[PDB]
Amino acid sequence: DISGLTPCKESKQFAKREKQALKKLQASLKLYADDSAPALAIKATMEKTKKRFDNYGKYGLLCGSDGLPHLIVSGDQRHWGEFITPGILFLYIAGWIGWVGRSYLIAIRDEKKPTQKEIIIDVPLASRLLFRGFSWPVAAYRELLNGELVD
Amino acid sequence: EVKILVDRDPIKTSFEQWAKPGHFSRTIAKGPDTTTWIWNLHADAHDFDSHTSDLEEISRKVFSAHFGQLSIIFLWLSGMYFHGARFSNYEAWLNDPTHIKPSAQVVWPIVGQEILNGDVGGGFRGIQITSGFFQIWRASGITSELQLYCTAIGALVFAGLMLFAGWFHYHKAAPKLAWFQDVESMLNHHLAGLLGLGSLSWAGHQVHVSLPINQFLNAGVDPKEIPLPHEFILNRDLLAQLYPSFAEGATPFFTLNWSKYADFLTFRGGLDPLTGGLWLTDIAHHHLAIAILFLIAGHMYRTNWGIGHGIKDILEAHKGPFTGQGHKGLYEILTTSWHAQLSINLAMLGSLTIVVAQHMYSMPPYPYLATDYATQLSLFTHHMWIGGFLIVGAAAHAAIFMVRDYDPTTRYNDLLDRVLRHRDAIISHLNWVCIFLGFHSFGLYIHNDTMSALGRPQDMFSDTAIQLQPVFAQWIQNTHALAPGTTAPGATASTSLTWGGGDLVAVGGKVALLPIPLGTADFLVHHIHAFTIHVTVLILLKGVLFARSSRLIPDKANLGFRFPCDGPGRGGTCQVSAWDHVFLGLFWMYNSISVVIFHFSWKMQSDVWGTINDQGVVTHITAGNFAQSSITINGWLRDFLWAQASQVIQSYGSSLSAYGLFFLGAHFVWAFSLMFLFSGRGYWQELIESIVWAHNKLKVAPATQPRALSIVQGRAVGVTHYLLGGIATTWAFFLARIIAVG
Amino acid sequence: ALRFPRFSQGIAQDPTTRRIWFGIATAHDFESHDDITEGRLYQNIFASHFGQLAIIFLWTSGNLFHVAWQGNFEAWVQDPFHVRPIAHAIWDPHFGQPAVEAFTRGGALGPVNNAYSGVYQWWYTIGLRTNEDLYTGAIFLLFLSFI
Amino acid sequence: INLPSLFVPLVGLLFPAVAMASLFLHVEK
Amino acid sequence: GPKRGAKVKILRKESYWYKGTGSVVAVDQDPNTRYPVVVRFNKVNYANVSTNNYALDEIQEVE
Amino acid sequence: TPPELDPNTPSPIFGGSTGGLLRKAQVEEFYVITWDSPKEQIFEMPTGGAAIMREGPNLLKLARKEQCLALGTRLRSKYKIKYQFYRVFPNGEVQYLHPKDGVYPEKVNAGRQGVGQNFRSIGKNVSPIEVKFTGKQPYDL
Amino acid sequence: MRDLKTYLSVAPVVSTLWFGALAGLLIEINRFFPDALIF
Amino acid sequence: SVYFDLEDLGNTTGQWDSYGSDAPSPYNPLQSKLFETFAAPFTKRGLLLKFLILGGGSTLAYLSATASGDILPITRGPQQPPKLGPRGKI
């Protein structure tokens, strides 16, 4: 496949890793009464493990010769979840944070003692400016075209 | 006329000051113009001297502060007992101490951290603890989780009481200065009431609760089957079955027939063969005697009745031809300056913590402690570190007194003055002895490395070449080993197995203790210790003696205790302040303590610890390589560091993986300190200028102007991250090593 | 200046140890010396470049000379895969017998160091085959040094 | 091995002694 | 010169508030005063100073 | 105005220290500070330790001028007492140093000519290239 | 009370509560949607 | 009772000879003549410098060039057969 990699659902080493992991967990599990808390814990770890491998296989991940998921970030449309989508989500949240902070700093810039509201947060103001970040691309895009973004 | 003096409601209790950061300082209360303000707020938070000139208000502040500290500690103990009751394998451990690892912390199952809950035994999964609480609890006679719960509740209550006591003695009833200054009374009460009644009542618990329950445990009876502690008090028949002395009650005590009490008050010495710890009978007797000593000691100083010494009298009585007026004037100094007191007490408390480390390694006071190598290593290292830090602090506050409180026109002392008049001789001599020591200790190591590298082992300093035997220490060892027969007849065995002669104490197949051999390697490391300590002393003492003035800076005192310098003039005057001497002394203390704990680790793993086979065959953890390996730097590099870092570096995928993570993290923080230590704030300020420009361009420049850290804070952050990094590295190394191969 | 450093009376009038250190440390910063001009600057730089060249040629000639005199260049050109190239012989009176035995590698009759500069592969590739070639090249580069 | 016994102590002991003495006198003048 | 309370731009290159704006406090009428224009600023410099004297050619009235 | 004369007045009470004069005093130069005290009193030595100044004239020899101005500053600030100091060379010559013209340099006094005063703002200094290959510095103009 | 609220609005307290809330959120999300490497 | 004198700057700045004694030569007269005649050539510092440098270098070169194998392992050379390198290299 891409970069000479093999799909995780078709990778032998991936499966062998799952095997050895589960077998290690069970090898540890042998020493505890089945109804006890350690047993339930280790078993929870086993179920979580196999669910993890199964999910990675299902997600269409490509594995190396190591048997581990490698990521494709070239923009390849079969792997947008491997960087593009969570990247967009990140950018959205970060833009939200930065835009809200910017709003707060601008809001208190014209005051008697601005530094005060920088060491003691005006929670009502902050709560008012909090949700404005939801529309940060729209708000910033318009400020960009207007000339209210820079000086 | 010593009496209770108190002012009523000195400070109104209000949250008004909570809403005003930096209220304690007129400068800081005004608010921030730059970011520097923030740091200052935290730096001067507990500097009560810079808050007020009034000794009384300061004294009150420190008193309530102490109450806060005690509250915190009680909350901490509460936590330890509660975790010992609810999240531990303590009972299981009681059932089998020799094959179960002490654990009292469990982690929640998220993001895979569940792996940290390892197989510690007892059908329990968790983090192995190395604090040594289990052996304490066993020694105290605790058998159930319920008792631990109750102790936790008690500690929480006491936390509440200490907190309330702080608030009360600051806001409601705050002691007068004369009250704090009653040092004769304070000394009496602390000698007799604190230590005396403390070890007396503790001896009470030991004789009535510890001894019997431990006798049962050692007998082998199931803990749940063992009689509850109150029964041994209600039914004297049980104690009588264990120790027949109790059949005669407290009669032999009052009739001076103390010999009858030799059942539970012994003087055997050495270690109990079936536990690897000191005899609890010896310990009870010890605490009883100590109690008597301190009780009579607390009746030395004159208070409200004619009898008793006066401190000032004893001080003014000691004056020689070399010293003139002697100790006259010192009472006034030590009754008006908190920093002098803090200096003395820090020096002595630190030293004490050090002696505690040594005495606790060589004379294991808790049952099943000596064979819990993880716990022993941890305790030694921990208390060593605490000690060193406290000592450096002693230097700091000595210097702080020297700058802020010293006044020879009002509170003169001859000894201090004479010290100051020949400080050049003192410091120069310390300098020389440090260079000499360095050469004649480290130079031996380099000599050995060179000879070893050149194929000339016969030219090395070792036990198999040019020998350098610790004859004096060996003589002390022999003397202490032969003591029970000669100079201490009433003693059965020696005070410690580590002395030159004796048998061998083993528990559960592991070696508890054996005679510790001293050779050329030990001579070498001991002289390294002498060297490093001497250098640390050089730095700190130079710092305090020249805190006020020098030929370079005649008016240094006016610059304060903590200041970066006095400019690039005079050739350059960086780090002239006593604070900077505390700063360098910290690095050297780190050095010394590091080589000390390495010494302990290697020596213990090599010549002491290990398993013991039938017929008496002892196999040590590193097979006695110390004597041949620790004589070159390469030996420490390879046989100690490289060899023993194995456990930490391959701890991934197991319960010890957190130690690998902390290994890397600590290395990182350590390197990270070097950025602060090697650089200067000018560069950072200009970089900050550019970044600030970038923020202005997008209308996001803060009103509180971003400032580079001060020179001093750069140094503080540097040394703090350096220490945290290095120490945490050795922490992870030690713990992973000793937990895996122990 | 009446004493070292002669190029700076400011440093020369220093009564301290600094005078020496800085004297050594500012020796090549011609622009900041006393009574200097653009002419002296360029001329000193030019002469200095010639000096550097001489040092390079002398260095290379030293390498050639030592490989030819104490190395196993011929043995290497006969079998480059299984011969460790000798950089130079070593005479250290601090050595013990095990040190002497251990450092006798290659076909040497005494202690040597193995070259990791890769001069063997270079010289062999470009045409050098014998010790004599190396000697003549050494003499020529020595000549270039003098020149 | 013949020459090295001559040149090594020459460059390692004699030369640096001569040079250090010379430089000392030069710098002290 | 500029009036009192006038917003002026700083033209002195070595000033902490160079290319920035401040407010005029008072102008010295003494013609011997080399730097009459007293200016006060919103932010302090590295020396914790919020005020400085400038010459007539070192300020630029803007709005 | 003529400078103050320097006679042999008694020195303060002190047991001696290791912070006093060295060979520099013998070969190069040392310093002398004089003051007039209203009474016998304790003062801290610039070279470390405590000494007693006598009543009347006092004369103390120090190793550095900075020590002299330090002690003098402590005198004028703490003990409200006027002081003077001189520099002394091995040949015996004495140079009056402080206060130079009888008036403290903090307060203005007519008669003093300017030294090293540039009548231009600091930013108007020429670039180093303007003074290349000359003996001049941009701040010497 | 107003002073106490002002104190609760101070930088370190605000940060402890904010990052506490965030820590809780991320923890619960990683408990419900665990081992996420995609999306 | 003072310690400042312009005429006597010596006593003023403590330029004293703490342990120097004005005593005459306590040495052996015959031995004195012996040393004054036999040690004289080395009392010229330039000549002594030249002699110590050239003579010292000459001596060093002598004892070095003629050092026995029983003293220096470096002159004795290897006595055991050579070991082969890691990759079959000589």
Ligand code: CLA
């Ligand atoms: C509970 C009610 C209460 C209230 C409203 C006050 C109010 C006040 N106290 Mg009082 N006091 C109290 C209880 C109270 N106190 C208690 C329980 C004690 C014993 C500790 C004291 C002992 C005391 C002293 C010695 C002093 C005051 C002072 C003050 C005044 C200023 C303090 C301030 O504003 O900083 C508020 C401080 C904080 C918000 C920080 C709390 C610090 C905690 C307690 C330390 C432990 C934290 C611990 C290390 C956790 C760290 C975890 C990790 C991040 C490392 C203010 C009027 C000061 C004063 O009057 O100055 C003139 C003063 O010097 N108090």
Ligand code: CLA
């Ligand atoms: C006996 C206990 C004790 C007490 C009551 C004091 C009290 C004092 N010290 Mg002293 N000192 C001590 C021991 C003590 N010290 C020790 C053991 C040392 C050696 C390190 C020193 C060295 C020292 C120096 C160099 C200075 C003081 C100063 C002071 C004064 C101001 C303290 C302050 O406000 O800082 C506020 C408290 C802090 C800022 C705490 C932060 C410290 C670091 C950052 C914490 C370390 C990290 C931690 C271990 C783990 C972090 C985990 C995680 C959070 C990352 C105050 C009188 C200062 C002073 O000016 O005196 C007049 C001063 O400059 N001390």
Ligand code: CLA
């Ligand atoms: C083309 C090559 C070249 C040339 C001709 C120059 C020329 C110059 N440089 Mg530049 N420079 C260069 C490359 C060059 N540099 C490189 C590669 C660096 C990075 C290191 C620098 C970084 C640099 C700085 C920071 C400075 C200069 C300065 C100078 C000027 C004064 C030099 C001087 O007097 O030092 C005197 C010579 C010494 C002090 C001795 C140098 C030896 C050093 C300290 C290392 C010795 C350690 C030794 C090897 C250890 C022994 C190992 C053994 C024990 C095992 C001169 C114009 C200076 C200047 O005048 O700027 C205005 C100046 O401050 N250079």
Ligand code: CLA
């Ligand atoms: C220039 C590079 C260079 C280097 C790094 C070396 C290095 C060495 N030589 Mg070799 N040598 C060289 C060139 C070099 N040589 C040349 C071109 C010749 C032919 C004349 C020799 C002839 C020679 C003999 C006969 C011997 C050595 C030996 C050695 C070894 C011991 C040092 C010694 O005593 O030599 C002394 C070197 C000389 C007498 C020749 C150098 C004279 C040149 C022309 C002037 C060098 C001045 C120099 C650059 C100043 C630097 C110091 C200054 C910066 C302060 C050492 C590995 C000894 C050896 O091999 O032991 C195992 C040995 O016996 N060399």
Ligand code: CLA
């Ligand atoms: C790099 C040049 C160099 C050379 C060629 C040597 C050579 C030697 N050193 Mg080494 N040494 C050096 C640098 C050098 N050193 C440095 C830099 C250090 C400090 C790290 C040392 C530290 C050192 C120590 C501590 C010792 C040596 C010793 C030796 C001798 C080896 C032991 C032996 O068995 O010889 C046999 C040696 C003898 C039989 C006695 C030698 C008598 C000499 C040859 C008389 C010369 C007299 C003449 C006036 C010297 C003036 C020279 C001067 C004018 C330049 C050997 C002569 C050992 C030694 O000196 O043994 C006595 C020894 O103990 N060295």
